């Protein structure tokens, strides 16, 4: 059926950028990103573009730029009030440029995203959800050393705490395997727990992120629960601003050229 609604969603994202800074002998790099979402009934399109606009200072010879086009296809299947259905898609492609030794030095690879949506209502205060992200398209002749074609599993549950306070959990599962190789335990299986609690209150959106630690790696790395933070402010409802803040890993190093913070800023709008 052709559902009627018509809705658009456009947002952006930047890190630091030439706006707020303090230093007369150092600088960083800003990576501006864009997002374009189109809502048309059961069919929901979503795409995102990347870019880079750092400060030039005569690095090598020429400046070679590179972009990464991303697409997505959302589809609603539905079935019952308790259990729902859906279909999600994605398109990833990266271009390779080698201006060091000309001679038809160029590769070609793609990435198909396929992750359906599953919903299961067990109670009025218990919302279950799960979806497996599969990636298949390119063979990766050089990237074969790690991965290229494999299936992933990422579930997500929602538990309502209060009328103006909710909770959300997520279980990440990594997977790896070659197209065809005589192995017994070559496949990799990693697990990462990540949860966030959505807090809706007036014109202020704050969804803290929880991350457990002290359950992996020899040395120390993870600590405390609240490591992430999701901000949200809409001075006009439609237009809002989201900010991602983290506090994981230890900051014990020095430099004078490279530097990356643990925060993020972005915008969102609807037509």
């Amino acid at each position: 059926e052709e559902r009627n609604d018509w809705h658009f969603n456009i947002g952006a994202m930047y890190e630091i950028e030439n706006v707020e800074g303090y230093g007369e002998d150092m600088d960083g790099l800003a990576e501006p990103s864009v997002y374009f979402n189109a809502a048309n009934g059961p069919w929901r399109i979503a795409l995102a573009y990347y870019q880079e606009g750092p400060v030039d200072y005569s690095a090598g010879k020429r400046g070679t730029w590179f972009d990464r086009p991303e697409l997505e296809v959302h589809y609603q299947f539905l079935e019952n009030d308790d259990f729902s259905f859906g279909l999600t898609g994605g398109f990833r492609n990266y271009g390779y440029h080698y201006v060091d030794e000309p001679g038809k030095d160029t590769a070609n690879m793609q990435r198909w995203k396929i992750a359906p949506d599953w919903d299961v209502k067990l109670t009025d205060d218990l919302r279950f959800n799960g979806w497996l992200s599969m990636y298949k398209f390119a063979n990766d002749l050089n990237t074969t050393g790690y991965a290229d074609t494999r299936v992933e599993t990422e579930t997500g549950l929602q538990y309502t705490f209060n009328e103006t306070v909710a909770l959300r959990v997520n279980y990440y599962l990594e997977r790896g395997f070659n197209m065809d190789d005589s192995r017994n335990n070559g496949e990799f299986s990693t697990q990462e727990i990540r949860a966030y609690l959505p807090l809706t209150l007036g014109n202020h959106s704050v969804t803290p992120y929880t991350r457990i630690g002290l359950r992996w790696s020899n040395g120390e790395g993870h600590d405390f629960n609240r490591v992430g933070l999701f901000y949200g402010y809409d001075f006009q409802n439609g237009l809002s601003v989201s900010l991602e803040y983290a506090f994981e890993w230890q900051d014990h190093d020095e430099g004078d050229s490279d530097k990356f913070h643990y925060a993020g800023v972005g915008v969102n709008y609807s037509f």
Side-chain angles (χ1 to χ4, degrees):
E1 288 257 90
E2 285 181 320
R3 192 107 125 164
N4 49 80
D5 231 57
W6 210 39
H7 205 67
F8 220 66
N9 233 62
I10 55 115
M13 181 100 112
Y14 54 106
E15 241 237 49
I16 309 140
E17 251 191 25
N18 56 326
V19 188
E20 49 267 318
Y22 194 54
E24 292 106 288
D25 215 81
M26 51 144 207
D27 232 298
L29 273 92
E31 248 183 322
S33 288
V34 188
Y35 309 94
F36 297 124
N37 251 283
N40 201 32
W43 268 60
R44 227 168 297 193
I45 313 104
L47 58 119
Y49 265 72
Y50 273 53
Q51 205 148 231
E52 221 147 47
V55 186
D56 294 277
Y57 63 107
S58 268
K61 302 268 161 176
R62 270 98 81 162
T64 184
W65 261 235
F66 60 85
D67 226 278
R68 315 222 283 198
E70 194 203 329
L71 293 160
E72 285 212 336
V73 188
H74 218 200
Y75 195 61
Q76 302 217 254
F77 265 113
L78 267 109
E79 195 88 301
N80 234 262
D81 287 308
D82 286 56
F83 297 64
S84 316
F85 228 103
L87 213 88
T88 328
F91 216 115
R92 268 250 258 198
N93 195 66
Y94 54 107
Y96 231 57
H97 223 89
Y98 246 84
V99 63
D100 207 320
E101 277 195 38
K104 263 171 165 47
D105 209 276
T106 327
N108 279 90
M109 289 91 75
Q110 289 146 116
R111 292 159 115 83
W112 229 110
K113 234 167 169 173
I114 311 98
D117 229 340
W118 275 53
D119 219 79
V120 188
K121 269 200 155 210
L122 186 106
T123 330
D124 271 75
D125 261 59
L126 305 173
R127 262 159 222 162
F128 284 81
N129 202 322
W131 55 94
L132 280 83
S133 62
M134 179 212 280
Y135 256 135
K136 311 194 134 72
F137 212 140
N139 200 338
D140 275 301
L141 278 73
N142 221 51
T143 306
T144 171
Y146 247 66
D148 59 282
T149 313
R150 212 54 256 158
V151 295
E152 262 163 337
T153 308
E154 42 266 51
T155 178
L157 254 139
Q158 196 277 352
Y159 311 83
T160 334
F161 244 87
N162 212 62
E163 303 206 74
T164 67
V165 187
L167 216 96
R168 273 225 151 199
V169 186
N170 243 50
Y171 197 67
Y172 213 119
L173 288 157
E174 237 189 340
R175 225 101 116 167
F177 190 74
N178 298 120
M179 224 224 219
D180 189 58
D181 292 75
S182 265
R183 54 77 248 169
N184 286 126
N185 198 282
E187 49 140 41
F188 256 96
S189 318
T190 322
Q191 63 186 50
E192 311 220 284
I193 310 163
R194 193 259 239 82
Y196 55 92
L197 34 142
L199 228 141
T200 43
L201 213 153
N203 295 128
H204 197 108
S205 343
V206 290
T207 311
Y209 280 49
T210 75
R211 210 266 133 65
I212 53 139
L214 192 86
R215 200 217 221 188
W216 194 231
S217 231
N218 304 13
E220 257 209 24
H222 303 84
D223 55 80
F224 225 61
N225 215 31
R226 296 144 236 198
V227 288
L229 205 301
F230 217 82
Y231 193 68
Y233 214 62
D234 49 286
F235 58 76
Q236 220 201 30
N237 265 57
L239 224 157
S240 201
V241 296
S242 279
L243 263 89
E244 245 277 43
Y245 238 119
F247 219 103
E248 298 213 58
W249 255 273
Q250 241 62 71
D251 220 77
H252 267 171
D253 233 49
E254 207 97 328
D256 208 30
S257 267
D258 200 46
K259 217 131 90 162
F260 210 89
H261 222 344
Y262 265 81
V265 189
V267 295
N268 269 353
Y269 179 88
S270 75
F271 254 127

